[PDB]
Write an enzyme that holds these catalytic residues in place. Structure first.
Site, PDB file in Angstrom:
ATOM      1  CD  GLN A  19      -2.539  -1.817   2.720  1.00 56.86           C
ATOM      2  OE1 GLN A  19      -3.085  -2.494   3.480  1.00 56.86           O
ATOM      3  NE2 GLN A  19      -2.504   0.128   3.301  1.00 56.86           N
ATOM      4  CG  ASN A 182      -1.223  -7.343   5.298  1.00 52.11           C
ATOM      5  OD1 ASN A 182      -2.110  -6.252   5.434  1.00 52.11           O
ATOM      6  ND2 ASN A 182      -1.009  -7.206   6.824  1.00 52.11           N
TER       7      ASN A 182
END
Ligand SMILES: *C(=O)[C@H](CCCC)NC(=O)OC1(Cc2ccccc2)CCCC1
Length: 215
Positions: A19, A182
């Site tokens: 991210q 993740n």
């Protein structure tokens, strides 16, 4: 012979992404769910565009957070989502540059798993494929995880603040778990993954916000 599933071996999962400085956990989670269904329906997958979701899903709040169901909703209405290549991840929100020429997948809706039901979540993972989920990933013990089956009683099931992807489930050293993908880079946890306690009273709230896209 206990039920076990690892979609990574099945080709339903793309490499772990990062991210960066952007609260886009939900976009990677949604893209991950869409990617699993893409492979399952078309026999092959690609890296879908999380940036596409960040910039266009007006119902969500970009780097400020968002719900995966809004992402799926968006793709259906928009009649498509771009591939990572056509709409590359830059790590911050910008105008919506969706282009139908770079479409790589479609969505016809979504289904939520009954809140708190790990059994239903288990069946969904097994019958649908990778499922989008949310947890409380604020604990320090969670962030510095490296191996084994994660379990910390302080994990607050009523404080969902991080979205991830359940790409499977099973058991290690007698401890049942969920295989969680993740989006903090492969540098995090175990090559980007973390095994979270399964059937341990819905630890971290793993089943409080699970859903998948219909394709
Ligand atoms: C994951 O990167 C984001 C981080 C949000 C930055 C503040 N987490 C997130 O989107 O949490 C969910 C949506 C949300 C955001 C903020 C307050 C309440 C809810 C909650 C679970 C899954 C997305």
């Amino acid at each position: 012979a206990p039920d076990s599933v690892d979609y990574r071996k099945k080709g339903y999962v793309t490499p772990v992404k990062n991210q960066g400085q952007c609260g886009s956990c939900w976009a990677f989670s949604s893209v991950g769910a869409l990617e699993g269904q893409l492979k399952k329906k078309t026999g092959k997958l690609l890296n879908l565009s999380p940036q596409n979701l960040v910039d266009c899903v007006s119902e969500n709040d970009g780097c400020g957070g968002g719900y995966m169901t809004n992402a799926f909703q968006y793709v259906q209405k928009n009649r498509g989502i771009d591939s990572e290549d056509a709409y590359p991840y830059v790590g911050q929100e910008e105008s919506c540059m969706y282009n139908p020429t770079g479409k790589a997948a479609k969505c016809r809706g979504y289904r939520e798993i009954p809140e708190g039901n790990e059994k239903a979540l288990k069946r969904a993972v097994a019958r649908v494929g990778p499922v989008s989920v949310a947890i409380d990933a604020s604990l320090t013990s969670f962030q510095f995880y490296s191996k084994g089956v994660y379990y910390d009683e302080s994990c607050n099931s009523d404080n969902l603040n991080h979205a991830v992807l359940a790409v499977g489930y099973g058991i290690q050293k007698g401890n049942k778990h969920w295989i969680i993908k993740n989006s903090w880079g492969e540098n995090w946890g175990n090559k980007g993954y973390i095994l979270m306690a399964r059937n341990k009273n819905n630890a971290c709230g793993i089943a409080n916000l699970a859903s998948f896209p219909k394709m």
